[PDB]
Amino acid sequence: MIAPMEKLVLAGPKGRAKELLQSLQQAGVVHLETLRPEALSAYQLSPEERAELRRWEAVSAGAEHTLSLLGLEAEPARPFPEGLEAAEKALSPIQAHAEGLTRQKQELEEELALAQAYLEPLERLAALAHGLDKSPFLRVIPFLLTEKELPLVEEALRKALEDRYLLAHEAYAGGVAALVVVHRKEVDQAKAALSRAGVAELRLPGALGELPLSEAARRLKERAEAAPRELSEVRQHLAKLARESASTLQSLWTRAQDEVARLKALEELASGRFGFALLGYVPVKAKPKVEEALARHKESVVYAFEPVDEHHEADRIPVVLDNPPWAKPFELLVSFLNTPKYGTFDPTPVVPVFFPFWFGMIVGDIGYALLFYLVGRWLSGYVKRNEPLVIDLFALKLKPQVIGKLVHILNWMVFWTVVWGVIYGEFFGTFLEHLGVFGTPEHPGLIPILIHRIDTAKTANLLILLSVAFGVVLVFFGLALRAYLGLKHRHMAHFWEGVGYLGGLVGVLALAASYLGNLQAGWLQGLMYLGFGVFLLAVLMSRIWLMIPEIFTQAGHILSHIRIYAVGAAGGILAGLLTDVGFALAERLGLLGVLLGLLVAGVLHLLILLLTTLGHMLQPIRLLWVEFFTKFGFYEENGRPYRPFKSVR
Amino acid sequence: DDFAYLNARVRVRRGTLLKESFFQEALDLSFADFLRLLSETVYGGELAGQGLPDVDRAVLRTQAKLVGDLPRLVTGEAREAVRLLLLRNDLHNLQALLRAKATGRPFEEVLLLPGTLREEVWRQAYEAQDPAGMAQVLAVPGHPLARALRAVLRETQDLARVEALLAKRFFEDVAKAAKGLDQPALRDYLALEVDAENLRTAFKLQGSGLAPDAFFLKGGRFVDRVRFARLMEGDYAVLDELSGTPFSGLSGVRDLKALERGLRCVLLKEAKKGVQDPLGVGLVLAYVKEREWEAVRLRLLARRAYFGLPRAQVEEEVVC
Amino acid sequence: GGLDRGLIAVGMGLAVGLAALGTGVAQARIGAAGVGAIAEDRSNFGTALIFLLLPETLVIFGLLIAFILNGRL
Amino acid sequence: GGLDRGLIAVGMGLAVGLAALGTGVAQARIGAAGVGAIAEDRSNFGTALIFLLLPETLVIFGLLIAFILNGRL
Amino acid sequence: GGLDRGLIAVGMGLAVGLAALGTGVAQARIGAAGVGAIAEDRSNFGTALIFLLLPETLVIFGLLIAFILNGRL
Amino acid sequence: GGLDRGLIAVGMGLAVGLAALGTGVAQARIGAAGVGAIAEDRSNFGTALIFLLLPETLVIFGLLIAFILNGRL
Amino acid sequence: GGLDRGLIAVGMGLAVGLAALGTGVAQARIGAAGVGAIAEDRSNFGTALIFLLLPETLVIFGLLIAFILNGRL
Amino acid sequence: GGLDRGLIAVGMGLAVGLAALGTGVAQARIGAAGVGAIAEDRSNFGTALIFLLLPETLVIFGLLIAFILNGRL
Amino acid sequence: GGLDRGLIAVGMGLAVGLAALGTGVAQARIGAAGVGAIAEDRSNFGTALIFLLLPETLVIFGLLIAFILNGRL
Amino acid sequence: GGLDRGLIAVGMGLAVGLAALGTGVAQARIGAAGVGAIAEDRSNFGTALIFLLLPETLVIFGLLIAFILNGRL
Amino acid sequence: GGLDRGLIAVGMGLAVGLAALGTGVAQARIGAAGVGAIAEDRSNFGTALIFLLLPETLVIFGLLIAFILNGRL
Amino acid sequence: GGLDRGLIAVGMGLAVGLAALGTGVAQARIGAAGVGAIAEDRSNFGTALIFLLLPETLVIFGLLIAFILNGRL
Amino acid sequence: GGLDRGLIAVGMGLAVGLAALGTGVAQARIGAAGVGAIAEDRSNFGTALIFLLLPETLVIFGLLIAFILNGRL
Amino acid sequence: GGLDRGLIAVGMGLAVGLAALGTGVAQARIGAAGVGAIAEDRSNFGTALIFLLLPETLVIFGLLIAFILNGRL
């Protein structure tokens, strides 16, 4: 349940408080309140403190950036045990080396890309420009164009002086190797005209379009030749540097983040002349974790562990789940919705009780359960190796903690999902249709397939009755808890609404079980009249004009529990039919392609399992989180998370 | 998400408009006459005092009140379509914040023009320690600004390269998004806007030697890469070649001012042709564009009447 | 009387009902647009009503067919 | 036989149901527009009511045909 | 007689009803656009009415087949 | 007898169902506009509610006809 | 005849009705777009009518089948 | 018996099903608008449900007709 | 047979009518897009009709099947 | 046996199916809106699910009527 | 003879008609997209025609089934 | 014997089919919005699937009644 | 050899027809999006083809069931 | 077989066809969004398929019910 907590009040010398905060941060939990409006100073940081914060922030930023450049991860590690100056003097060389290596790698890679971008055009241009690279009147101009539509530019060329500067594709089969060489700027005017008529200029960026043709091509080829070795050396040096500096960089990152957190926290204190004070909240069970640290304060600070506020106007009080080991691994399935207000109930324990049993009722195939056990074996082995489950396809980053929690949940599910299966036959699908170890009065076996689910006409009434019964239980418990919480928080309107809802539902259920069910309503007429009267009395005495439509909606939420029976029956019937067809095809037909029949049955069962397990798992939790939690409040008021103070890594 | 619900309200609001007589009668009045007439009109609801700053602030506030309510009061695909009408102010505010962060100026100096996002989001985005964090703070479910910021974020950090690629990618992404929904008029207006923006950018970068392909935008239909290269490289007859396209009157013009006036007239006409879909987005487009033109003309006439410019220099700006 | 009369009644009902559904389908969009225009200016109601009252032809013709069937049955 | 009045009933049922569907199909748009206009200016409600009350003239005919068919039952 | 007359009547009613539904569906959007145009410019009164009254041919054809069948029965 | 009651029951059921469908079709758009206007400003709640309730007169008319037929049963 | 005649009439009514619905479904959108274009530029009226009257071929193709079936009476 | 039972069953089933479809059709739009408004501001969750629940009367009436039919059966 | 002819009539009518509805559904959107492009540039009026008459093979096949059936009568 | 049970089974199937389609139509739009709001802010999943799973009451009531019919048969 | 021939005919008719409606429904949107893309860039007609002529497999399969039924007849 | 088995088969088919159509109708829009959001950010791949597999309850809640009838046959 | 040989045909026809209608309703949006993307870039034609020709699985399954029933006949 | 062997086929067809229609209506919008996103980035093909191919469950269930009925008759 939502853990009880108390406001720790503490105060001391304005100088000793800078180390008291360090001790508390290196200690356990405390959610620090803002504390500033206390008829006292807002404890604003000193100018040298502000400068210290900036230096540490720079250290953190540089460490993160250098780690990213080296490719290493940002995960914490052992702290950096150095001052600000030492940390800066350690981070500077690595940052410098990484910057230089990155610049060198970018230069080498860009040079390689540029050289390979125009290799064949450069070869063709070197071929054509064998005698007009440097000319007095005018120089040859290259033209890298598309396929040999060169007549398009030759139109404007012939409109100009065709008596010189003939252009055609000679090499570079990737395109037309165009270029023109002529005296005077008549070639330039022809180049403009050919651009108008369709032509492009081969002025590649850099030395390619800015140096003499042959020498530039030779330099480009030399750069393309030498770039491999430089790139390899740069990559090797960068990788080695990263491998050497990763641990130090992580230590620096942890130290910097811790120090910056401590400073920004120091900005939250209350203050006065020679004094500092705090007013954070800590869980009542966690008291010795703070006390065994804040006992050794320099002045032996006040450390007044004062009470919680009551439920009276304490919505700012932090909340944490505080559940026993049985229920905690299942808290993942319930944390994703709104947090509790403060004094309102925690639904965490209900789920481990009521979800796996419902799931086992939903799925009963012994073979499917064995398959689930094997999958759990794989996942648990992977978690045991501590290697996180990375599945990039669906963006899965399951850390080992989540893997372990899910493994525990799956084991507790498989227990009931096999027990209820063996309590209803349907082993490995419909294996009794080939060998009836489970059996029934149509063909008796080694053991009774009690409450057979395949035979719809027999057990349907029983299963539907059981489903609606469990639903009535859950909805009644939810309404009761709402009534109790409305009484405790002294919400008379809430208590009246809850009582009226329960009474009206009882009255409707009584009238229903009389009319729509069996006869002999002698012991039920009084209950029905009482329920209707209670509903009317509560509505009148609460004046909320609560919708009898809302009562009907609650009735629907009660009736919705039949979904368990429905889904279970559909899954069982489909699996049984598939297994029967497979057994028939394999043994009853041919009897030599038994391998083919078994393979077909296995493939069909596997496909059905893969396409239906998601809904099978989702339906129980849907019922829980849509009906019970909605009834018990638990989707309003939103709460306040219990953020502790610091202690990273 | 019912266009009829929005369109009836927009019809009432467009019925609350200032006639061409207001623009013609103020066209020969002093700043005090423009103030008194403005105060008597609905545009003078929030007109506080006197002076060009007061006129400008009042125009901004009235326009925000009566045109900034469009993305709210409508949801679903109706919202997803009407949101790609009023996005230029958001683009400008994000660009201004990016430039201020890049240079180093305080986040309390920018103007923070009223747009489609949240003002608190704009303020908090400046304090983001990474451009990715700024994008996330500015991220919305389906904002083209957020999508384009993510796209440009795959190119560079907070630099001029990111600043330019962001504008180019936002224009292209708005074009694509408008093409990705089945609204007859929105696709046409967005395509005409893309073509006009490409032509105006080509004219602005005239003689700069920049690569026409690299400066080009895609999405329009009244221009091509060849025409972009021609116009950028100085062939001021390319604008004479684009005849037949909706932007055909811009043949023989070679000045930036004339080109801007022509493109404004063409786009205003195309947006005023959207009044033919009374139960579509077209009436919304007509109301928005007419409101913007009214604001521009009002501000120009009020500045002329305030700073004492001559009549002949402003009358040519109320042509459309 | 008889199955003949019963089937005739079913037919008459189907005709009148389908005609009314068609007239309604038209009047929906026509009324929405006319409401918008009259909101923009009340001066155009002489066109809005004069355009929304036209689709009564569908239901009137359906009523004619139904009354003819009633007479014959 | 008894199929006479049985089918005569389904006829009036189809008539009334289809007329109500049509009036509802009109009243959706012709009322959403009126709600918008009333929100923009409360003085638009007066015309909005006359706009949303006209589409009753189809259900007010389907009822008449159903009444006649019931009368002949 | 009996089933013959009843089924003929049902056929006639269905034919007329479905034709009227088609006419109404077309007239909806056509009249919406016309109401818009006539609000934009008073000179569109002729063109809008001429475009909207055109799809009544569906109703004419449906009622013609209905009258022929009624004469047959 | 045989069909003489069952077909009347079917007629009543179809009538109620189609009239409820019509009233829901109306209520969808008229409810959406009401919710939007109220969320924008809480001053239009009364007019928004009256514009929601009026088209329920379609389902009120439809259930009267079904009751009349059932009483005839 | 008595048995085949009614089913023939039902088939004819179904054919005519479905073809009229198809023609209305086509003529709604094409007629709306045409009104819009003609309002934008009065030099497209010919292209509007030469598009709008095109799918009226569907109702003629259906009414031919109806006439053939009625001839087989 | 015989048909007199099955026809009443079909009538009841059709009535309940069509009322459910009507309620669903209205609830889609009303609930979408309410979800949008509540996500805009959490102070509208009153007038969200206080209007999203009103269309349930259109299913209550259908359930009442179903109960009356089951009583007479 | 007495009923074979009538059921053949119903089958032929259903085939022709459903084909006419399918062709009408395609030709609505295709013609709308076409009557846009040919208003934006009159050179598009060659591609528009060449796309708008393309789908009528559906109605052609439907009439072929219906003619085969009505021949086998 | 025979029709006496078949025409109850058909009614139960119709009730269940129509309720299911009604719930699906009600849930599509609300589900889309909820997905949008949850994507915008992951703190609205509570209201999103509460509004999305509400219309299952329709399918619940339909299944109740189906089970009552199956009991009556 | 008997009614087997007529029932087989109705089955073939429904098969061809429903497949035709499916092909038309696909072709509407596919053709609108094609008539946009080719009008924007006339080079893409060679692909737009393919993507608007692919939905003919529906009618091909429907006619195959109808031909099998006719051959059985 | 009798038509009991056939009518039970028809009821089962109608229930399963209508439930499948409803589940598809909801899953369409839900999955579209989910695909869009997951494309925008590949971290909502959980919430998208969670809110998309929820509507599949209608298919199972129909197949239940279908299997009950199959047992009773 | 009674009506069974005909009801089998009606079932086969309905199966193939509705399967084709579903495949068409899918291919509409799938192919419109595919055409848009291929017009944006001619490279994506392979993905467009895969997405547009995937939903033929439903039609193939429908033809499989129809052939099973026909071969049983 | 008599009426049983006949109407069992009608049930099987009405199941498979309606399931196919549901699967198509579900897969349409999802496939459109998937094609759009895959065009936006040529890496999300897996995440697009993992939501386009999920709604095949409805068609699989339809085929299951159909095969069960075929085995039972």
Curated annotation (Swiss-Prot), chain B:
Belongs to the V-ATPase V0D/AC39 subunit family. It comes from Thermus thermophilus (strain ATCC 27634 / DSM 579 / HB8). The gene is atpC. One of its GO terms (biological process) is proton motive force-driven plasma membrane ATP synthesis. GO terms for cellular component: proton-transporting V-type ATPase, V0 domain. The keyword NAD does not apply. Signal peptide: none annotated. Produces ATP from ADP in the presence of a proton gradient across the membrane. InterPro entries: ATPase_csu/dsu_sf, ATPase_V0-cplx_csu, ATPase_V0-cplx_csu/dsu, V-ATPase_V0D/AC39_subunit, V-type_ATPase_csu/dsu, V-type_ATPase_csu/dsu_dom_3. One of its GO terms (molecular function) is ATP binding. Gene3D superfamilies: ATP synthase (C/AC39) subunit, domain 3, V-type ATP synthase subunit C domain. Keywords: ATP synthesis, Hydrogen ion transport, Ion transport, Transport. This is V-type ATP synthase subunit C.
